[PDB]
Amino acid sequence: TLQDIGVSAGINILSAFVFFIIFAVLRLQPFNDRVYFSKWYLKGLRSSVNLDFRSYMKFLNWMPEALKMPEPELIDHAGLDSVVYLRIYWLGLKIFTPIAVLAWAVLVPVNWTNNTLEMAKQLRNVTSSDIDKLSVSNIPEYSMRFWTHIVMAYAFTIWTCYVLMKEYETIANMRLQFVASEARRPDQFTVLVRNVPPDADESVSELVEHFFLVNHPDHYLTHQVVCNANKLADLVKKKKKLQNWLDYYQLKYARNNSQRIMVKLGFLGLWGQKVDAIEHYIAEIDKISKEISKEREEVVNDPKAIMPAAFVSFKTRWAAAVCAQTQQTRNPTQWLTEWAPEPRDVFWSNLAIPYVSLTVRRLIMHVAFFFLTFFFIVPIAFVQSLATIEGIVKAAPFLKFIVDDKFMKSVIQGFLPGIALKLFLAFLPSILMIMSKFEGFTSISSLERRAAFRYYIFNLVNVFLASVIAGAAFEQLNSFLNQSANQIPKTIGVAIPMKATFFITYIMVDGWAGVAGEILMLKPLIMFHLKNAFLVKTDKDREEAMDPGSIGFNTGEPRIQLYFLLGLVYAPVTPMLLPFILVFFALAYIVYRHQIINVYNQEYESAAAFWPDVHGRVIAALVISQLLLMGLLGTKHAALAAPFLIALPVLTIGFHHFCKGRYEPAFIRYPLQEAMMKDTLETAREPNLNLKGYLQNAYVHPVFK
């Protein structure tokens, strides 16, 4: 089967190169913009017949320079978020190249010697033609060779810890080098104040003014109070639609006047009567502007519509950090102050939630997520069993009998049990985001981090265990509740080696296909070129998210974390996974890198704040691998193996706490020394400027233009 696994790997990787070579269709085809190639439009890098000269690019024109770019240049090119979200793949490569080489060179000799040693079969074809069981399953039960495996785990853990520390430090520095060296972010001068207490007869702005004038003098440039502006929101959306229509009309008329074609409201007939179709639109523009002026200034100064919150902006980064990192009032749930996110980041929907409501919602949704993940299968199984092809017979399917069906469509109709499951798994990121938004979090970044954690846990349970143990998740939970605390590692560890090869197959299929497509799939082409004729036109109306808002940290960090888990679990047990997984990282660190160059924007941007999240998951996967190896070595009766492999997770958790205490605070909480240096430098560079004008207009709302 070793020959078979080599051949299957070759076929899959050759299909990978085939997708990479159909990637060489762009820049030869007419209009040469299949991948939207946002490079000049990503951050407006220049925004605002074709028979010869092929020149045979041979994909050499993109392959090396995705590596040939300075890294600060990449940071300014895309942002610290995306550079770190590629440094995650680079990290994974750093974990699994030395582990791979050392694991092979030490285990595989020691591992594959049980039959005999120092023989003449090395030159024979039996060297590389037998079963691919040069894994821990080859060693007899009580042989001392198992000791080697033990030490390898230690080494691997230590090595992983090394990079996980070094890596961590690196990203920390980068975030700091991001905050100190940047150009005029309003969020550095602003603090979100939440849950101010009601007063008898005093406007909320009056409360905030008095409170932050008494308690934060010498500072407190200004403050913006928040409000529920729903009418203004729909009106400005209508204004944006009208603006798009007017721009389209003007462009068409300049392209072709058509003797002043006046067509409007022709669908309704008598309504509109198609008077002028130009003066009409400017009429709605003027009208909309009128009620926005009339009501925009009215909603701000009225009660029963001003929820308790504000974005207080200060005169100094030092002062803003001071107000953000302290608590103000005797009640720790009143006058909450936190570092204001980027104005783009803010989640304006959840700034009016009392503390008791927060706690209630968090408990409700923790229970709900538990019930979701552990009773994953019951409702979808029920509905799929209800959705039967024989039970769907009705008057309409009379023309849709088996006579015309089942030809090329029978695959989907027979795979419908998989269709319902795939439907739910496709909605799952959305369910996790909804459950995150319900428990108010106020910042898109925190929403994404919470959804990433929920997805990580759900993905762990379902994918990992349902791959390793029997089918249903709730019965698996019941069984694990009815096994000893010393039996769970034993059963999962003993089940690992047979699923080794299935995990090899999953790595190739899922990971390799994902990265191979990720350069360009059906989906981006079929959305963009269809939206070409669907929404407005080819590419105008820059109020749109067809170009991806952000490469998913919500979705995608959990997947590569799962691959971390596979790599760490199978390093001491069956190292045959360990080369294949490497290739995935390799290709990933290419594709997404090049992808980060060309087609991804930033929906928000918060200084790689998510990294401690990732680091915690890597430590968790490492501990899981150590526990499963301890269980497996417990099953295959060895020397004292439970003590070593149970003391190792303790050391891993201790190192995790060291990292969580040392480098982690730099990702949430802004040092005073850095603020003081930046403020002194800013005063030296620009000795005069009106900060008030630049500040008290960035945290109003997106609706208030």
Added chain:
Amino acid sequence: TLQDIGVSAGINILSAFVFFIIFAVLRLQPFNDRVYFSKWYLKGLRSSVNLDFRSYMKFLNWMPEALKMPEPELIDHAGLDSVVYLRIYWLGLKIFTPIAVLAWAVLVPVNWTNNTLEMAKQLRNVTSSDIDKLSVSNIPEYSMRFWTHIVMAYAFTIWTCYVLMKEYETIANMRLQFVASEARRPDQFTVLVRNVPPDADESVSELVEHFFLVNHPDHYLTHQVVCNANKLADLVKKKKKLQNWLDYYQLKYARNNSQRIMVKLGFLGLWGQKVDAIEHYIAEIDKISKEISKEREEVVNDPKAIMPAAFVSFKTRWAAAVCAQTQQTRNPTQWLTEWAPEPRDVFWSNLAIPYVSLTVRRLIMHVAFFFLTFFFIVPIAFVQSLATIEGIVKAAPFLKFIVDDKFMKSVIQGFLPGIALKLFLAFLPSILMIMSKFEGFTSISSLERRAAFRYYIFNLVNVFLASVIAGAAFEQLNSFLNQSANQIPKTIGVAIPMKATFFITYIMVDGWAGVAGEILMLKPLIMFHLKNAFLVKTDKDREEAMDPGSIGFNTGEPRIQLYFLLGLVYAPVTPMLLPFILVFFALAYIVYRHQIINVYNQEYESAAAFWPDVHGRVIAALVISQLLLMGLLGTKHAALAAPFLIALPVLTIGFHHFCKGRYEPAFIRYPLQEAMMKDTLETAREPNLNLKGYLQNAYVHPVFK
């Protein structure tokens, strides 16, 4: 046995009143100071033949006024720490009086009806003469009466939560009312700075000056750097001994000149020669003062003896809170700043520990404490087995054979297996304190909190489980590792009801004897009246801790927490515990209260900072009780009981998180609004004062007078 339990309770409570009546020996005996009665000496309330007129106090002269005192008066009398440490007993009373009355009035009827209902035996002696099994053990297996028990648990939990919230709020307010209304605490203006980084050629004081002048301007009154002054410490101790000797000599000479008795160094003979014994002592006083002046000023300004730390004192409470609650430098483990404890509180021994050393020590001692608690019995069993009466035979015990022994001493020689155990349990608070100090914590209060947590966990495991399950703790851990996760509650809950009566006996003996003695025991009299003739004299030389430094929060909070555990576990199962335990609380809330009046000082004083610790333990004990009740009701096959009693702990933990998020921050981290009001009031009251002189002398060291 119900008659037997009533009689035993009567005997124990009558012995309690007998100890309370021998408590009526003071104030009739000559010199009437058996209990040292520190009331006038506790905080110097006035510091600096006897045949008729007995007047028959009849312990009515202390019994009511221990309740008849305003509570702010008590706070100023002893401190917020001790008032809260009595409010813990008051809390316990508030938990267990309504639970007691409602549990009796609802359960005991419903509980004791299984044989039949609406009978004529109520007037018969069988009403209150049978076995005391009107407990949950009386109800048949599948009877729906168990539902009642379920709801009771809910009610009890809810009620407990109620007080635990209300209580919590109350103490929070008190701490705030303590900090805002107080007279000139230096700690309110000072922040402990730790782990400053080394510099090439710059004194540590220079580093701190520059750092806090650049980053904390408009503030930073001064700073005190710390040092290792060991020689100065022993020299000043010798100075204190010499001062005591001189004071004793002067007092004796004034009492009796004895023709100028000149006796000194008479033990050595030729040494000293007893020249004058007065000019000699003033000579050592002058000499000691000389080298203290010479070396005290030299050790401060030299390297290799100044560890990285300082106590930076500011110009405003607002500024001090700002510096305490923020982080300064890019490295979160460098330039650590925390609210300075009281100068008395500071643990000067652990202000020079890098972060990596802290983490290493914490892991080492977490592992060590685990091994201590779970292998509690092995070494002491080994040493006791080695210490045999027959194996101790030697040349010395020739005169100490059985001929003269075993008469009245055979009890101890046969109880030696208990003697070794009791010895270890007596040293256990000291071991916990040592293990707390090893992991540097910088503040006596934090040392006490950590030791209290360690004692709580150890006490839980050993006392509780070894009372409920079989003997050895390590074999108990092995068994619990080899039982299912669904079997631990089952086994402990089923073991609860038979140990109910043993817990009744433990409550009377241990708790009642402890509170009964706690008014006055053998130990305080035999230490004080012996120290009368041992150390110096009756009561002079006020450099001594014979009067207790502090009523033990280190030791004693864990014990009454264990009693909380007993009360919460046995409310739905066997309510017969529940009156008896009440009495203990009652007597406790008297004795310690009166005790807090008369004989306890404050070794340190930090604004009842330990309360969230206590609240967390109460929530933990509540959850443990709910789990054990779920296990018991699982054993006695009832209606669906696992769901209700497993959803209840989730709600308990959620409420605990709500409390931990709302009221808890007020106990560690000083609000800015309160600081601003206090500073404005202080400026208004005293518009002029030199803060520098009052500040830069309180955080130097105790050695630098």
